[PDB]
Design a protein around this ligand. Structure first.
Ligand SMILES: [Zn+2]
Ligand SMILES: [Zn+2]
Ligand SMILES: [Zn+2]
Ligand SMILES: [Zn+2]
Ligand SMILES: [Zn+2]
Ligand SMILES: [Zn+2]
Ligand SMILES: [Zn+2]
Ligand SMILES: [Zn+2]
Ligand SMILES: [Zn+2]
Ligand SMILES: [Zn+2]
Ligand SMILES: [Zn+2]
Ligand SMILES: [Zn+2]
Ligand SMILES: [Zn+2]
Ligand SMILES: [Zn+2]
Ligand SMILES: [Zn+2]
Ligand SMILES: [Zn+2]
Ligand SMILES: [Zn+2]
Ligand SMILES: [Zn+2]
Ligand SMILES: [Zn+2]
Ligand SMILES: [Zn+2]
Ligand SMILES: [Zn+2]
Ligand SMILES: [Zn+2]
Ligand SMILES: [Zn+2]
Ligand SMILES: [Zn+2]
Ligand SMILES: [Zn+2]
Ligand SMILES: [Zn+2]
Ligand SMILES: [Zn+2]
Ligand SMILES: [Zn+2]
Ligand SMILES: [Zn+2]
Ligand SMILES: [Zn+2]
Ligand SMILES: [Zn+2]
Ligand SMILES: [Zn+2]
Ligand SMILES: [Zn+2]
Ligand SMILES: [Zn+2]
Ligand SMILES: [Zn+2]
Ligand SMILES: [Zn+2]
Ligand SMILES: [Zn+2]
Ligand SMILES: [Zn+2]
Ligand SMILES: [Zn+2]
Ligand SMILES: [Zn+2]
Ligand SMILES: [Zn+2]
Ligand SMILES: [Zn+2]
Lengths: 150, 150, 150, 150, 146, 150, 150, 150, 146, 150, 150, 150
């Protein structure tokens, strides 16, 4: 696992994540619909923005990003499930928080990986993305009544 | 085929299309890079909004939109191919124009389907989208040196 | 019933609706106050704009719009009730959804009526209004925990 | 009358006034149409905003605003008349000026009423509204060729 | 057919926008400042309708007229070299009524051929024309259909 | 007491209040987190603006505002408590509403006091602040399910 | 007459003109009030900027601009009259057009004066101002029913 | 001296004041030129704005504002002197501060005068203007090293 | 005289803006997106020059041409019904060079008559035309005066 | 010590700093008043933003920020003094530069400390803050006539 | 010397000037730092824009602009000196005014030269640039306590 | 080389680079003129901003930036050549890409240099600049038909 492979892995993860954001965006119900419906729009834009930046950083270091839905499913560690039985707002947010923690930890791995290879630019890019993920984790856990690391 | 499934089919198509737009966005090379790189950014946003609007119109009439990459692959008539053999700007644009022509013709069907079923809102929505698709087809063919219906 | 009578009927309906929106805007209580208070401001503007458009389309086809509260009360199928006992947030939203469903179904009548009479502009105007009403119905039902047509 | 009843009386007055502004907005004819048509939109917005502010100030002091067309008609001292016989621009403006003068004098009463009851906030709110009304009175009388207090 | 109708309107709208400039330039009277600015608004709107019509024609395989020569030969809209404000506005309302009625023909013409996009485009344009007809007739003291 | 002494007292009150707003802003949890997190930022800015205006009005009449945390603690009638055991959104909001009610009542004193000594500028300033405070009291009590007075 | 004095003369003229613009702004009556009231606001601003620019161009070439009302009255060729006998909109506009024609002709002289003296900057500045004056003369004459050079 | 005469007196004062602001704007020299040159532009706009509002309030209560430079000089208590010998930045600012204190005290008189006549609107207008004058007095005295009331 | 020159340009610019639309509509090739948008910019700029010229003519006592009829009869700018990108751009550069040289005549013509405002107006327009001439010639691979 | 303990220490420092900024903002006098009065508003906003970001970063890693003036005084290494005897702009600025140098040196500690414990997000955040602090130190020392270090 | 040679000469002058503006921008110290630091940014943009315009006007008339630092040094009449000893704010401003006076006088030559050659566009371009230079000369001399031509 | 000398070396490099960007901006010809002409303006602004940031960071750590064309030529490793023989768009872009690669590699050296000297702020600044340079390298090589590291 080198920097190129790690970045391509995150390209796949983020494409699975943004579609999951749309899933929550579409199917949510409950008293918090209006607040959290718009909030998902914000997350979709932000993480869609991360995905393009990760892909273009991969391009800038000589890599070739995955560019099909097939490649995303086959390579993503982020998990998706179709929407079958109705779910509560808390359950949807727990799926979202779980995926955010996944991305956080994988970004932690990439940060160390890039420190190893001497890739300072990619290192700095991932740190900034992780800062936002940590903030979202605190906020969405606070929504669930929990502490960030609980 | 009824209105609900047609809309869901396009939800799948548009998700494959936007990823194809990113593919062209990322891998394009040649003298026209800067113009078409930015042009792909515009198309990605516009068709991302068509996808969200179609999904939410489907929700509004009692449907349940596909919300996973797995469901998109199984249901999309738009075809994708990983990027292995380096393609020219003309070939990437010819692939793009092909998918636009595909979506136009499929929307052409949906418009008749919805006029028959008496769904006036979904009918008008599809016409507005087709108007934009027809304009893009003309413009990208002109870029390729071709006439719109060639 | 002809096109002029239908549009004038909706002029009365929409004036009753916007005042009902103000009632909910003013008297609402509960944990969702801040979100739904602001949301009611948005609805007030949108349907006040529909009302002005309907009246001016009526003017444009030779009609004479109702222009007094007296005429609005006498002609509106939308029903209003003074605010005496404290209602819950859910009860206000159920009244709002009910009135939206009323306007949706009556607009459906106008759409068929205007298609028959060959009034293409008014037909398209009513379809656009219905598109928005259907979206609001989906969103507010989701807030109540219910499906759009349930 | 106490402060709560006075404010509620004005809630009814302003709802009748804004509908009257729309009446002039819709039915006006003559060479001054384009200027005064747009001018009525400005007045509609401003006095619609006055109405919301009055109602919410009433809410802030423990009151319960009228929230139906029925209650507005029953309580308003402002008079409305259906539009049956054609009227001139000057006659419409003279109807508008009369209502502005009505609101001014009633606001002056409320200003003295609120000074007596020691409601300093409501006192200041009504003074600011009167400032704008006095300016409109000067301008529309000047339009009519008259002095402000003529 | 649709191509012939759209190209016909390209000629009409080019004659119309020049007529709008004519009113814009020559008007006099107490309503000068309001209607002078109003004509700029109409010039932009109908100049934009013209561009949309021409490019819709392009999008369906047509070739729009693109010279003053071609506009004069094909336009049903009438122009006259160079009035009171009322005379200019009645010339304007007449052309708006002309364009409205001709658009009605195109709407039914396109409904037949199954061109829903061009159909929808013409309806939206007619909506604006009907609104202008009401407002300018009201300026003249008249009812919309009078 | 006099006007100078009153304004300096509120400078201390408002500095304690804004830090309390940050406390609620930071520690809040529950389903209403996203709405009320943003709302606290708005309150922080508005009451931060009141504090600067009060201090600069005190300067304008020859006074000397307190300008240290030491002086604020010594002079503020608003009470603060460190955050040891967790509390709900409702308890935080009831603490917030309590402090707003305090400021409302103390401003009522200043409004009569300043009109009394003939300080018309400071009188008008305090009325405008109370107008906003009364509105916040109404809105946040409505959030709590209560009437303004309750 | 040299460049410095000509500029100072116009400093006096423009200060008298803007006050005359306010006079028309304040006292105008008739059906055209709203349009011309706002139009006077535009003229006041534009000619206030001409005055400041002329004064600062005078400063830049070593001059000393008049800076008191006393100096303006003694040096201005533009004439003012207090408002006693009620004037019509036409008469106020005819007074305005007269002063514009005055300024045009005096600037006409300054342009030749500065071309002779070789002051290219001041020459170009006066031409730009005259361009605006000529346009206003045409527009206000058209308002009066007249041709520009009538 | 009644409200009408007082307002007309201030119309004259402010026209003398704004020309004085231009005098300072034009002739100032020293290290503080760039900061204070722009600051005078701000004061010119603000007090020019006060003048129009005062004049139009006079119009709204039946008065007739002075509208010539002649009337301003003859009625103004604000004093002007042509610019002869060079002056320091401190001296120019002391002339400005002196005039501000003059306007403040005269506005104090008008506030009491309007309280007497029961003119609540004009009373409120003058208080707001005085608030700004008091702030400028503090700031410009601070520039001179002095306290506001020193 | 000045009136005759300005009215002549009213006809020229109306033919020019329609030619700009012609290029805007019919262009094809790899530069489509850039030059399609560029033509919209030129249409606005020269449409604005046309309005300024007509209203300056009005301001000095003239009467601007206001019909397609009058434009064709008086315009020295040439139009042809409907190319490669190079052919369209060379047609555009030619008209820009035409307008430049004719404006030079008006500048000296107005200097004589002592019309400094119209003189200054034409100079500012020529400044923009010269810049466009450089840029479009560079696009064609050529030097500005080549 | 560790990262949590460091961030909470700076929360206390920054709360003392912003009140000190207000102190300088309020009491400053001299020829540079207008420039530095505005500059202090900018500093108040920026360092107010640093405080919120530090507190929310502390929350994101599981910490609990101090949230009372009591806790701020007890923990801040930044020193405050009430304003008894007058001081110059230079002495106020030297107090400001001193506190900035303090924050610079303490942030240097945190930057090495957080890189050490592997907190990459907090490390990057503190570097960005120090970048701005170093710039402020350079600029304000240049104002004082001194070199940055010195 | 012809038009092409003059414009190219100014291309070299302006590139030396903008770097000199940066020198003052970077090294300045003293109480006026914040105002004049920002002012230098404004000058840098304006004269960088003049430089681009001059070069592109040279291109437009068939010329070939200098495009290297080597060519700029070889051709510039504007003089530069490395920064060794600390200069005062006044000394930097005296160097700036000196260079402005140089550009003013040389532009005067170009204005006469281009009037003779019949290059009306370049003539007008240079006049506009001189208008700005003359204003800067007035303002910066006033900062130094001197008259514009002294 | 230490940090101060490295930053000063880049001050010289960037001034040579921006002038080179202008050279390409001015002399370019071919079908890609309009896109790349505007693109050079963007690059001119960005790297002009990099230059100011580098110089001011050098100032913040006690350094003295080069501030003359003489000093830039003497210290720059970036090479410039006058434009005598015509060049193609590709050759101009290849000159641009070469300089970008130069700056990247030299910035990488500075990044390691600053990590060694413990200058965390300057380290982060150079990393961010390198991120942008790497992106430009990918895009302009793609324009040339090549891979980023080819
Ligand atoms: Zn991208
Ligand atoms: Zn870093
Ligand atoms: Zn090519
Ligand atoms: Zn990109
Ligand atoms: Zn993208
Ligand atoms: Zn959505
Ligand atoms: Zn949505
Ligand atoms: Zn509200
Ligand atoms: Zn309306
Ligand atoms: Zn009339
Ligand atoms: Zn309307
Ligand atoms: Zn409200
Ligand atoms: Zn009239
Ligand atoms: Zn177009
Ligand atoms: Zn287009
Ligand atoms: Zn339709
Ligand atoms: Zn439609
Ligand atoms: Zn936050
Ligand atoms: Zn402040
Ligand atoms: Zn009072
Ligand atoms: Zn007030
Ligand atoms: Zn009339
Ligand atoms: Zn006004
Ligand atoms: Zn005014
Ligand atoms: Zn000025
Ligand atoms: Zn100035
Ligand atoms: Zn006014
Ligand atoms: Zn008051
Ligand atoms: Zn090509
Ligand atoms: Zn015009
Ligand atoms: Zn015009
Ligand atoms: Zn000139
Ligand atoms: Zn000019
Ligand atoms: Zn302040
Ligand atoms: Zn926050
Ligand atoms: Zn690191
Ligand atoms: Zn960083
Ligand atoms: Zn700076
Ligand atoms: Zn350029
Ligand atoms: Zn090519
Ligand atoms: Zn350029
Ligand atoms: Zn800088």
């Amino acid at each position: 696992v080198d920097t190129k492979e790690f970045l391509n892995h995150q390209v796949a993860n983020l494409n699975v994540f943004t579609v999951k954001i749309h899933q929550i965006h579409w199917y949510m119900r409950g008293h918090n619909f209006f607040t959290l419906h718009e909030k998902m729009d914000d997350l979709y834009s932000e993480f869609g923005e991360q995905m393009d930046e990760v892909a273009e950083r991969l391009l800038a270091i000589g890599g070739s990003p995955f560019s099909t839905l097939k490649e995303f499913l086959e390579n993503a560690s982020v998990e998706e499930a179709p929407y079958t039985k109705p779910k509560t707002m808390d359950q949807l947010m727990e799926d979202l928080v779980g995926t955010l923690e996944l991305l956080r930890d994988e970004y932690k791995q990439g940060i160390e990986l890039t420190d190893k290879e001497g890739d300072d630019v990619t290192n700095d890019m991932l740190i900034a993305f992780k800062a936002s993920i940590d903030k979202h984790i605190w906020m969405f856990k606070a929504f669930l009544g929990k502490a960030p690391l609980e």
